[PDB]
Amino acid sequence: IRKEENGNVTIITQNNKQIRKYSSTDSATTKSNSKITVDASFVDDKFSSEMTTIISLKGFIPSGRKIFALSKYRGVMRWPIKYMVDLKNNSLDSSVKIVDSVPKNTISTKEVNNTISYSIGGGIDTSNKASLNANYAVSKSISYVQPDYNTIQTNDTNSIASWNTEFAETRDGYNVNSWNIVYGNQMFMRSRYSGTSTTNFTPDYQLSSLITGGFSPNFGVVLTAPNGTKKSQIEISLKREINSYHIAWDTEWQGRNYPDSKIEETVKFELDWEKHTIRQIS
Ligand SMILES: [Zn+2]
Ligand SMILES: [Zn+2]
Ligand SMILES: [Zn+2]
């Protein structure tokens, strides 16, 4: 397959048949300083019965971690047990559809690599693997990291694709279910007999970057639309759940994780299928 560049246009030729790809990028910042970036690739394929747009979602959700002493004998580490991302298609009434998305099902690897491949005619192939060793007319790579976390697709329909990236288990084998009758839950406990109430949490170099910094998701969807479609809408929601991991000293440190708070923010984007643009609206 031959491809050639012309700014935001890629002319793709495969066996006498030619298609075009138009790129559009928009960025938005939320009230709580979460970041969302959408890369839309509008495909123009006269040999396909409909219009196809591939959307790459890249974001940053701050961990919101805080460490403070309740007293000399009780310390608290607030941390993001769960990150949630929704891409909602608001135009199913106009028969605009999400026809595929990645990641699929559940992914547990520290590094996530997905691939969205388009074939002339409309065909779509989605892989939870990396590529790009195949001769697809258009392939889009998706990649992010999630040390100590897992990602599950909780919704996968024409109307919505949803992902939960939730804490799984520490390297030492502790999770939110761990309970030792003496030391309680020790998932983020640096030691059982040392440190102060704000000094005895797992050092930063031994915590997931999702806890020390934040989550940098990269997810993907594919939308289709009837040939004449001018505009459609999507909504992207970023959600973070914070928990409070308490350590309390009796004659040793005892650990316990409590629920705390949830923050959800939503950004709206309009797709102009004629001008090949994606713009935040509202
Ligand atoms: Zn077009
Ligand atoms: Zn699927
Ligand atoms: Zn605008």
Author numbering: 9 to 290
How did the manuscript describe this experimental structure?
Clostridium perfringens Delta toxin is one of the three hemolysin-like proteins produced by C. perfringens type C and possibly type B strains. Delta toxin itself is cytotoxic to the wide range of human and animal macrophages and platelets that present GM2 ganglioside on their membranes. It has sequence similarity with Staphylococcus aureus β-pore forming toxins and is expected to heptamerize and form pores in the lipid bilayer of host cell membranes. Subsequently, they oligomerize on the cell surface to form prepores that insert amphipathic hairpins into the lipid bilayer to form an oligomeric β-barrel pore.
Here, we present the monomeric structure of Delta toxin at 2.4 Å resolution, determined by X-ray crystallography. It includes a monomer of Delta toxin, comprising 282 residues (residues Ile9 to Ser290), 139 water molecules, three glycerol molecules, one imidazole and three zinc molecules. C. perfringens Delta toxin structure has an elongated ellipsoid shape composed of eighteen β-strands and three short helical fragments: two 310 helices and one α-helix. These secondary structure elements are arranged into three structural domains: a β-sandwich domain, a stem domain and a rim domain. In Delta toxin, the N-terminal residues form a β-hairpin that extends halfway along the β-sandwich domain and creates a cap above the folded, monomeric stem domain residues. Finally, Delta toxin has a four-residue deletion in the residue 177–183 loop relative to the S. aureus proteins. This deletion means that Delta toxin does not possess a Tryptophan (residue 177 in LukF) that is important for phosphatidylcholine binding in the S. aureus proteins. There are three glycerol molecules bound to the hydrophobic region of the rim domain. Interestingly, when Delta toxin and LukF are superposed, the glycerol of Delta toxin is positioned where the glycerol moiety of the phosphatidylcholine would be expected to be in the LukF structure, if it had been ordered. One of the glycerol molecules in the Delta toxin structure is interacting with the Arg200 residue, and, it is likely that, in analogy with these related proteins, Arg200 in Delta toxin is important for cell surface recognition.
